[PDB]
Write a protein that binds this DNA or RNA. Structure first.
Ligand code: MG
Ligand code: MG
Ligand code: MG
Ligand code: MG
Ligand code: MG
Ligand code: ZN
Lengths: 117, 197, 127, 97, 217, 63
RNA sequence: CGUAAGCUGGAGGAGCGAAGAUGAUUAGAUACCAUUGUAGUUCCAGCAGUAAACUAUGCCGACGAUGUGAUAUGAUAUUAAUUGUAUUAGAUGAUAGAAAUUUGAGUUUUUUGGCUCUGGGGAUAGUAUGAUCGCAAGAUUGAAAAUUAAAGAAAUUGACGGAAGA
């Protein structure tokens, strides 16, 4: 009761994959959709499935749900992180070079502008 | 032969030439000297460019680049390999490497690659361990203190700092683009921000 | 023959691991005629040896063609009619292999021992 | 078979050692093959720490401690649960101080 | 029927690889029994060597299993041996025959003396040891035939050697280790480096790299 | 019955060698381009396990 | 030459203590527990020659993978290190082995560098008899008649503990 069965959890994880888009934030509308897409013998086990679906879907939107990949949610999240910084690390003109590392740059005859500590 | 231009500013910033306190017996010629106060070895940036040419030479002339796998276990390493994989059409494998993906045929995602690439050899042992069972070529970025079993090309870098690991993927992304399509390398230096956080 | 067996054991350890060269700290007139017979049939490359008013040194360069070399002690007096018996014992096949006999003409193969009808003391084998 | 690498004790390149005696039973044991513990206890209890303060003629003073060293044979030691049976693969761990 | 789950087996179904010789020289390990069946049909010869029952004790009773060994063989120079244990004696032999097809190997043949003539005999002397049993194979002149015991003669008839001399050393009453030692004895003779192999062979490309564009598309 | 010979230790390579790999390199001209030619080398199984396989390859190509 | 006992002669004897004698436990205790108590263990001069006297691994000689230590000492170097020779402790690989394990117990059926000693299924038996030693106790050498299909080494699965933890 207080701990869900592995048959319940496995059958709940599949419905997130194929039917992600018809989910919502509220619990009571998830009771309707499982009557369309799932064939369940009993009534009491059915309410545990739809209550577990809002647990996973809400923990997708803000939390860290491991071992579950949905293509739709991850794409727009990377678009928030595809912004570019205005200033990179490569804007600095002065490089800090050690007196040991100075001799390599002179041996290979490189054209960088090196300044020590 | 191609010439490295203004990539010395990338490695000297990102501390890619920094090493460990002690060196292994097989690393050898890649050390130019040590610091006096902190006793930290240095890596010659000349010969590391030689391995960058050679690793690209083995990666090219594959008829289909989808038959090339990259592995990574470091938490920072996920962002950098996914930027590298899309430009080179390679299949990336992130996280804990499941034992049996090359040999056992009952795993969920079976895969039959030809060329294997490894970020850190000590951190990813099972991929090199399963590369001894089926005949594969391996590329690895190794520090001064690592074992070199079951690896034929070594690119010596610094693999502790997460900022440095995205650089070696960044230089590798240009050369395969350069060897396949005749283009000027180092088009936009500002594209390193998509690799780092 | 302490020096001859000490030579052969160092080669089998070296040729199995795959090393290129070898340095030993003793030289001897028996060992020098051994290697010239090994050099003639083409099993190894060139070699050299240094005199330093001491036991002497020996330096040899391999090419990776040796299966096993060996030495026999004690040195048996073999007649002419028993070379056909010893050759079946210590050799894998009839088509190849070699033997070294310390005949009075010199250290020669068993093919020259039969061809000149001379039997003597036996030294060792290599193939 | 052999059970431990060093057979009973940690003695090498020697021939003999003079024996010492256990405190509980009193049998002779060699000084290498012994179990020795060290502990330091104070003269006063912590439960009687505050009550000496109201009876002190002095202003401030330090409470002193004493040390002890004990020796046992291994029959007495395992019976008093000083040293316990460990796993076979876990026998090779050595807890230096 | 057979379906090529492994990518290497898909090439042999599409008639890309003609014979076994490109497989053994390029050292591609096989991981399906269907590859040797499609390459070689109705020339497979097989048998069993021994069948033994092992019995393990538990609290109430004693669970009993059956172990069997199967030798697979061609006519000329392909021998493999695998083992399996099962609860049923019928399915014990059937799976063990498939594992023997995965362990197949070739053997070198030669002559007794000379250079010309049909190959009949193992070339050089070799010795195989697996768990206190040593088997020794000595080459023979022509017209002698195979002179050996009950079990390892039946293996050598599968390999195709007409004539050889054998000896034994050690405990041979366990037929499992006695069969595994002749495998190492046949392998050790073929692995000797000969002066006739001093000539340089031609470099080639792996056949997986050549037909890579056909496989994916 | 043919056998592949390793180019590094100059010995034949067995059939059941599980670590023998044929290393494939494309030939690249001056200034860097692509050419549709492949040059190969072969290695043995024992030389890779020790870690000697890297130092042979650098001296094979660059010298 | 040879721990520990054990013998003859002289010196000494604080604690410990075989043998002997008492108090409890027990069906029975001449045993474990406790109280007494002699020889001995201490020194000098001599005999005696046995131990799980064990690293259960005879002695000499050539070659060997990395890492952390220990004892002695030399060179470079200078207040900061990395290096030579001889022993020695431990960990990870590699070989060899029936396996536990393992820088030798490796370089072996593709068996050879030199030299001494020991074993041949269990039991009878280290027992009889003869010879040589010793004040004695005893020590070294060392069989057979009649018997018997097993005795034994390393390791897996159970069952049991008047065994231990969570
Ligand atoms: Mg002692
Ligand atoms: Mg005496
Ligand atoms: Mg004795
Ligand atoms: Mg003894
Ligand atoms: Mg001794
Ligand atoms: Zn005690």
């Amino acid at each position: 009761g207080n701990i869900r069965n592995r048959v319940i959890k496995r059958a709940a994880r599949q419905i997130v994959e194929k039917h992600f888009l018809s989910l919502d934030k509220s619990f009571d509308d998830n009771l309707l959709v499982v009557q369309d897409v799932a064939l369940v013998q009993s009534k009491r086990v059915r309410n545990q499935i739809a209550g577990y679906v809002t647990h996973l879907y809400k923990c997708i939107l803000k939390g860290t749900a491991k071992k579950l990949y949905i293509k739709s949610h991850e794409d727009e999240r990377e678009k928030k992180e595809n912004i570019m910084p205005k200033d990179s690390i490569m804007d600095t003109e002065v490089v800090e070079v050690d007196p040991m590392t100075l001799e390599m740059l002179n041996k290979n005859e490189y054209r960088g502008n090196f300044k020590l500590i | 032969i191609p010439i490295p231009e203004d990539f010395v500013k990338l490695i000297l910033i990102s501390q890619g030439h920094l090493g460990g306190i002690k060196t292994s017996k097989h690393m050898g010629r890649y050390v130019y000297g040590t610091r006096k106060p902190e006793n930290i070895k240095v890596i010659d940036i000349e010969k590391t460019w030689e391995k960058f040419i050679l690793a690209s030479r083995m990666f090219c002339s594959l008829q289909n680049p989808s038959e090339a796998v990259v592995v990574s276990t470091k938490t920072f390493g996920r962002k950098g390999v996914l930027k590298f994989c899309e430009a080179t059409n390679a299949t990336p494998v992130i996280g804990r490497f499941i034992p049996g993906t090359f040999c056992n045929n009952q795993v969920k995602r079976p895969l039959e690659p030809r060329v294997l690439i490894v970020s850190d050899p000590f951190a990813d042992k099972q991929a090199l361990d399963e590369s001894s069972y089926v005949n594969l070529q391996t590329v690895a970025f190794c520090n001064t203190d690592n074992d070199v079993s079951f690896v034929d090309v070594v690119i010596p870098m610094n693999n502790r700092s997460p900022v440095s690991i995205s650089t070696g993927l960044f230089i590798l992304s240009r050369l395969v683009r350069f060897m396949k399509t005749g283009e000027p390398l180092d088009e936009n230096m500002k594209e390193i921000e998509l690799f780092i956080y | 023959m302490k020096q001859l067996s000490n030579l052969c054991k160092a080669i089998n350890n070296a040729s199995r691991a795959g090393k290129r060269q070898l340095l030993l700290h003793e030289s001897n007139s028996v060992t020098r005629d051994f290697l010239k017979q090994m050099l003639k049939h083409g099993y190894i490359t060139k070699y050299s040896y240094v005199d330093d008013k001491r036991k002497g040194k020996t330096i040899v360069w391999l090419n990776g063609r040796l299966n096993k070399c060996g030495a026999i002690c004690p040195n048996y007096k073999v007649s002419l009619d028993h070379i056909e018996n010893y050759r079946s014992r210590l050799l894998p096949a009839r088509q190849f292999g070699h033997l070294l006999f310390s005949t009075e003409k010199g250290i020669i193969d068993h093919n020259e021992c039969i061809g000149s009808n001379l039997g003597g003391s036996i030294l060792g084998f290599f193939y | 078979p052999v059970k431990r690498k060093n057979h009973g004790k940690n003695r090498k390149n020697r021939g003999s050692c003079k024996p010492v005696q256990c405190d509980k039973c009193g049998r002779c044991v060699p000084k290498d093959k012994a179990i020795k513990r060290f502990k330091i206890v104070p003269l006063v209890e912590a439960g009687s720490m505050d009550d000496v303060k109201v009876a002190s003629i002095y202003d401030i003073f330090e409470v002193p401690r004493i040390s002890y060293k004990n020796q046992y044979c291994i029959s007495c030691a395992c019976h008093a649960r000083i040293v316990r049976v460990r796993s076979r693969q876990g026998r090779k761990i050595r807890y230096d101080g | 029927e057979w379906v090529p789950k492994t990518k290497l087996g898909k090439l042999v179904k599409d008639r890309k690889i003609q014979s076994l010789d490109t497989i053994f020289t390029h050292s591609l390990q096989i991981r399906e029994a269907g590859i040797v069946d499609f390459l070689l049909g109705q020339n497979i010869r097989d048998e069993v060597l021994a069948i033994k029952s092992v019995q393990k004790q538990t609290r109430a009773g004693q669970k009993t299993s059956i172990k069997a060994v199967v030798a697979i063989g061609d006519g000329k120079g392909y021998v493999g041996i695998g083992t399996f244990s099962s609860k049923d004696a019928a399915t014990a032999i059937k799976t063990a025959a498939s594992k023997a097809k995965c362990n197949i190997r070739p053997v070198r043949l030669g002559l007794w003396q000379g250079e010309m003539g049909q190959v009949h005999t193992v070339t050089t002397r070799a010795s195989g040891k697996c768990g206190s049993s040593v088997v020794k194979i000595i080459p023979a002149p022509k017209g002698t035939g195979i002179s050996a015991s009950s079990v390892p003669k039946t293996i050598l008839e599968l390999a195709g050697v007409k004539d050889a001399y054998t000896q034994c050393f050690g405990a041979t009453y366990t037929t499992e280790n006695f069969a595994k030692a002749t495998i190492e004895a046949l392998e050790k003779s073929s692995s000797l480096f000969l002066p006739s192999q001093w000539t340089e062979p031609i470099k080639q490309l792996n056949p997986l790299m050549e037909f890579s564009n056909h496989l994916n598309k | 019955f043919e056998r592949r010979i390793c180019s590094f230790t100059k010995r034949p390579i067995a059939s059941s060698d599980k670590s023998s790999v044929q290393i494939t390199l494309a030939d690249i001209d001056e200034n860097g381009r692509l050419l549709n030619t492949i040059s190969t080398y072969d290695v043995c199984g024992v030389v890779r396990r020790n870690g000697l396989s890297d130092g042979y390859l650098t001296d094979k190509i660059f010298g």
